[PDB]
Amino acid sequence: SLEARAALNQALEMKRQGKREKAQKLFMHALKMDPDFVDALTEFGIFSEEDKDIIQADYLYTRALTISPYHEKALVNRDRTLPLVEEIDQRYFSIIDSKVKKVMSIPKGNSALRRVMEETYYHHIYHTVAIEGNTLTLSEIRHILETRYAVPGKSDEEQNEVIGMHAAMKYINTTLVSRIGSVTISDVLEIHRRVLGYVDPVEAGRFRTTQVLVGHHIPPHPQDVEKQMQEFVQWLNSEEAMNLHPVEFAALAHYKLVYIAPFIDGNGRTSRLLMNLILMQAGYPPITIRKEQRSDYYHVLEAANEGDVRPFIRFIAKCTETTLDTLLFATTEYSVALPE
C-alpha cells in the first residue's frame, strides 16, 4: 500500500522529532492500511522498546517474522528481545511461585482458609458457567448444590450445567488429582461426561461427529479429532511438558484442547477443569478466569490462533496471581499488640 508506506515514513519522522503521540497514531494508521506490513510491525516494535515495553516490542518483531521469516531487521531485533522476554516471563513465574508458598505457609489452624476454599469452589463454578453465558447467580448456584431444589423461573439447562460442573469437579478431586500415572483421553472423556451429562446425555463423553466453530476459530474436522487428541495426550505425558513451569504447562494444555475443540459443546468448561487438574497435580491451587475477563480471554485466544500463545500464557499467569492474591488477602491475620 502506497498509503501505508507514506504513514510509516511520517511515523518515523515524527518519532525522530520526539512527537511520540503523533508517531504512535501514524504507526497504527500504517498497520490499519496494511495489517501485514512487515517494516511497520518492526518499526512499531522499536517504538515500543524505546518506551521500555519489551513484551510488546518482542510480540511485534515475532509477528513480523511469522509473516517474513528472513526479515533482517526483525531477526536482529527479536534476537535482542528474546532473552529479555524470557527473563521477564520467568521473573513473573518466580513471583507466582513465592505466593503459592505463602498460601502453603498459612497455619494449619486457620479458620478463614476453609471458609475461603468452600466459597472459592462455588466462585469457580459461577465464573466457568457464566463465561459461557449462564445467568445463574453465585447464591443460586450455592442453593442448587446444597439444597438440590430447582431455583424457580430459571431454565433447566442452566441448572443442569451447574450440576454437571459440580459432578465433574468432585470426580477430578476424588479420582484424578491424587492419582499416579498418565492423563488419558478416557480421563478427559470422563470429565466431559459429567460436565455435559445432565444437559446433553447423548453427546456427554464423546467426540463431535460434526464441524463446529469457536468464535473466530475453525477447529479441525471431526474425522481428525481422534488423531489430534492422541498427539495432545502424548504431549501431556511427555518429559518436555513436565520440564515446563506448571503455569505454562497448564496454559498450553488449556489452549491445545480448545484449539482441537473435540466436543460439540463444553470445550471451555472441560479445558478450564484440565488446566486446574494440571496445576493441582503440581501443588498449585485451582485458578478462576472471571466472567468479567471474557473479552481479554477471547482476545489472547485469538492471538494464539495467529501464532503467538505467549499472551495466553501471560493471561493465565495473571489469573493465577489474582487467585493467590485473593486467598492471601482473605486469610490475613491482623495481629493484636500490648500497649505495654
Binding site: 502506497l2 498509503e3 508506506r5 507514506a6 504513514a7 515514513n9 511520517q10 519522522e13 515524527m14 512527537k19 503523533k22 497514531k25 501514524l26 494508521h29 490499519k32 459461557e132 453465558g133 449462564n134 445467568t135 430459571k154 431454565s155 439447562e157 442452566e158 460434526t210 464441524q211 463446529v212 466453530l213 469457536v214 468464535g215 473466530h216 475443540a261 466436543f263 460439540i264 459443546d265 470445550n267 471451555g268 471474557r294 473479552s295 477471547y298
Partner: protein, 523 residues
C-alpha cells in the same frame, strides 16, 4: 484507474480539479466557468440540461428544473429539513420507500420519478465530461468530497451517485479536510492548528486540524448538514412573499415562476450585499403580469438571518471544547464557501477569535476541489505526490439500541477512522432467534433522541434461555467514514454461522444497476 479527478459535489456549485505535472488544475466547463451549478433540467423538447444551461432556464421551466439534491440524499420523507426545502423547490417531491423522490416532465407528455442520488449522478456526469474535454480522454475514477458532518446514509448516497455516473469513487473525503490540504500543501512551517470554517450553499462544517509537513490530523469536527446559502435565500424569499401579500393581497406560492424569479433576484441581491449596503430586487411580470420592485438593505438581510449567522459560532465553541484547546491555540482560521464572503459571518468569526484576521491563502470556491484533486493524485499512485497522510474522524457517536430504548455507544464522535469496535450482547427472551440491530447516530442517551442509521436483521441464533447466547456485534468504520456491521457467536456452535442482512431502505444493488443503465442512455 487512469487519470483520477477530484470533484467538489456542492449543494449549489460543483468544481472539478486534476493533479498533473506536479500541481492542481481546476478545470473550466464548456462555458469557461471554473464552478458549475448543481442543476439539471428537462426541456419540453426532451433535452436533458446539466450545469449553467439548466440554472439559466430555471425561471421559464421551474417544475422541470431540479437542484438542492445534496439536501435530499440520505434523508427520510418526513425529515423536517426535507419538508422545509419543499416549500421553496419548484419540482414535485414524492414519497417513495419513505424517501423523497423527484417527479419531472422529461418531455412529450411522459413523466419520470428520480432518486436524489440520480440527480447528483447527473451533476457528477457533467463534472466528469468537464474533466474529459480538458484531459482529452475518458475518466473512470474520482475522489468525491462530502460534508464532515454527513451521516452514514448521506455518505453512501454520494458513493451511489458516483456508481450511477459510472465513476469508481476511490475515496470520499470530508470537505474541511480537502480545504485543509489546499491551505497546507505548500506550507513547510511545521505543526499548526487551523480552524476550517466551511459555510457552503447547503452544509456547514467546522473542523479543527493539526497540520504538520504532509500530515492532516482532524482533532475535532462539528457541523449542520442543513445550514448554508440556501437557508439565507429562503429567509429573504419568505420576507418578500409576505411583503407582497401585505401590499397586494396576492399569494406568490400559486406561481412557481414567481417564487423562482424571486429566488434568482434574491441570489443576485445576496452577492451584491457582500460589497454594497443595499440592493434593488426588480422582477418584470412577477405575478399575474404585475412588476415587483423592492430594496433589500444589508441591515435587513442580516436581521432576517441573524439567528442562523449566530448559530455558526456553536460548532466553533464545540470543536474547541472537544479538542480541549484555547482560542489562542488556533494559528489560522481558514474560511471556505461563498457564504464566508458575507461581512456579518467574517465579523462574527473575527470577534469570536478576539480580533484575529482569517488567512488569505485559499480560494473559498475552489479550495475543496483543490484538496480532492491532491488526494486523487495520491491514490492515482503515479503523480510524484509526497508522503501526504489524512487522519480523519467520524462526526457522530455510533451506538446500538438495547432493551428500554437505550443508546449503547460503541464508537464516540471524533474517533479516528478507519476504526473497529466489538461488544457482546444477548437475547431479551427465551429461544430468541434474531437480533433487530438498530444502529443510531448521535450523542443523546436514548435512541428516540438520536438518528437511525439503519436496521440490520441478525438471524440464526441457536435456541437458548434468555440472556444466555453470547453474540459479539462489531462496528467497522472504513476510510470513507462508512459503517459495516458484522456479528460472531463467541461460544462453540454449528457450521451455519449467524447471518446479517441490512434494511432495504437504501438503494439495492438491483436498483443501482437499473439507475446505472438508465443513466448510460444519456452518457
Amino acid at each position: 484507474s487512469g487519470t483520477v479527478v477530484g470533484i467538489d459535489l456542492g449543494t449549489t456549485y460543483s468544481c472539478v480539479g486534476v493533479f498533473k505535472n506536479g500541481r492542481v488544475e481546476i478545470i473550466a466547463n464548456d462555458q469557461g466557468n471554473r464552478i458549475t451549478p448543481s442543476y439539471v433540467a428537462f426541456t419540453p423538447e426532451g433535452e436533458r440540461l446539466i450545469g449553467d444551461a439548466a440554472k439559466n432556464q430555471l425561471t421559464s421551466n421551474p417544475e422541470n428544473t431540479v437542484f438542492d439534491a445534496k439536501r435530499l440524499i440520505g434523508r427520510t420523507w418526513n425529515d423536517p429539513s426535507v419538508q422545509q426545502d419543499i416549500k421553496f423547490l419548484p419540482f414535485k417531491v414524492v414519497e417513495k420507500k419513505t424517501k423523497p423522490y423527484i417527479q419531472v416532465d422529461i418531455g412529450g407528455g411522459q413523466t419520470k420519478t428520480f432518486a436524489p442520488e440520480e440527480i447528483s449522478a447527473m451533476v457528477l456526469t457533467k463534472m466528469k465530461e468537464t474533466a474529459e474535454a480538458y484531459l482529452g480522454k475518458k475518466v473512470t475514477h474520482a475522489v468525491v468530497t462530502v460534508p464532515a458532518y454527513f451521516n452514514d446514509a448521506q455518505r453512501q448516497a454520494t458513493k451511489d451517485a458516483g456508481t450511477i455516473a459510472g465513476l469508481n469513487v476511490m475515496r470520499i473525503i470530508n470537505e474541511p479536510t480537502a480545504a485543509a490540504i489546499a491551505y497546507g500543501l505548500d506550507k513547510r512551517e511545521g505543526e499548526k492548528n487551523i480552524l476550517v470554517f466551511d459555510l457552503g450553499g447547503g452544509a456547514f462544517d467546522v473542523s479543527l486540524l493539526t497540520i504538520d509537513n504532509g500530515v492532516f490530523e482532524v482533532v475535532a469536527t462539528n457541523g449542520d448538514t442543513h445550514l448554508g446559502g440556501e437557508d439565507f435565500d429562503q429567509r429573504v424569499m419568505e420576507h418578500f412573499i409576505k411583503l407582497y401579500k401585505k401590499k397586494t393581497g396576492k399569494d406568490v406560492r400559486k406561481d412557481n415562476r414567481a417564487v423562482q424569479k424571486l429566488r434568482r433576484e434574491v441570489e443576485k441581491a445576496k452577492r451584491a450585499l457582500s460589497s454594497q449596503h443595499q440592493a434593488r430586487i426588480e422582477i418584470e411580470s412577477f405575478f399575474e403580469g404585475e412588476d415587483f420592485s423592492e430594496t433589500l438593505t444589508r441591515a435587513k438581510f442580516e436581521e432576517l438571518n441573524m439567528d442562523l449567522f449566530r448559530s455558526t459560532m456553536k460548532p466553533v465553541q464545540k470543536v474547541l471544547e472537544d479538542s480541549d484547546l484555547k482560542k489562542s491555540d488556533i494559528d489560522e482560521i481558514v474560511l471556505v464557501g461563498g457564504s464566508t464572503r458575507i461581512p456579518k459571518i467574517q465579523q462574527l468569526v473575527k470577534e469570536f477569535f478576539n480580533g484575529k484576521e482569517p488567512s488569505r491563502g485559499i480560494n473559498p470556491d475552489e479550495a475543496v476541489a483543490y484538496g480532492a484533486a491532491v488526494q486523487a493524485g495520491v491514490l492515482s499512485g503515479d503523480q510524484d505526490t509526497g508522503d501526504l497522510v489524512l487522519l480523519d474522524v467520524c462526526p457522530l457517536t455510533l451506538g446500538i439500541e438495547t432493551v428500554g430504548g437505550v443508546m449503547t455507544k460503541l464508537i464516540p464522535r471524533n474517533t479516528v477512522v478507519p476504526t473497529k469496535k466489538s461488544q457482546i450482547f444477548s437475547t431479551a427472551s427465551d429461544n430468541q432467534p434474531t437480533f433487530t440491530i438498530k444502529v443510531y447516530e448521535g450523542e443523546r442517551p436514548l435512541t428516540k433522541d438520536n438518528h437511525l442509521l439503519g436496521t440490520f436483521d441478525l438471524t440464526g441464533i441457536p435456541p437458548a434461555p434468555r440472556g444466555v447466547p453470547q453474540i459479539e456485534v462489531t462496528f467497522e468504520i472504513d476510510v470513507n467514514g462508512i459503517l459495516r456491521v458484522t456479528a460472531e457467536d463467541k461460544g462453540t456452535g454449528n457450521k451455519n454461522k449467524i447471518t446479517i442482512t441490512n434494511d432495504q431502505n437504501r438503494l439495492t444493488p438491483e436498483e443501482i444497476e437499473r439507475m446505472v443503465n438508465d443513466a448510460e442512455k444519456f452518457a
